[PDB]
Amino acid sequence: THWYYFKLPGLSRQWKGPQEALQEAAGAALIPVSASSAQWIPWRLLKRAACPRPV
């Protein structure tokens, strides 16, 4: 899994996350943005965070 800071494609003065991507595709990652929704965020609105370590 890759983890990302994200901005929403249609808003955004603050970075959100980092969040674990649920899936990756060409030019976008599927990011949880609420308790009931995920959004395909284009790369230009993502920053790759370091992966956290299992406990």
Numbering used by the authors: 10 to 20, 22 to 65
Study text:
IN first catalyses 3′-processing of the vDNA ends, exposing reactive 3′ OH nucleophile groups that it uses to attack a pair of phosphodiester bonds within target DNA (tDNA), resulting in strand transfer. In this work, we determine the three-dimensional structure of the deltaretroviral intasome and characterize its interactions with its host factor, the PP2A-B56γ subunit. The deltaretroviral IN host cofactor B56γ14, as part of the heterotrimeric protein phosphatase 2A (PP2A) holoenzyme, interacts with a number of chromatin-associated proteins and potently stimulates concerted integration activity of deltaretroviral INs14.
To aid the interpretation of the cryo-EM map, we generated a high-quality homology model of the STLV-1 IN/NTD using the SWISS-MODEL server, and determined a series of X-ray crystal structures spanning the catalytic core domain (CCD) and the C-terminal domain (CTD) of HTLV-2 and -1 IN. The IN/CTD structure was determined in isolation as well as in complex with B56γ. While the canonical IN/CCD dimer observed in crystals could be docked directly into the cryo-EM map, the CTDs could only be docked as monomers. We speculate that the dimers and trimers observed in IN/CTD crystals may be relevant within viral particles prior to vDNA synthesis by reverse transcription.
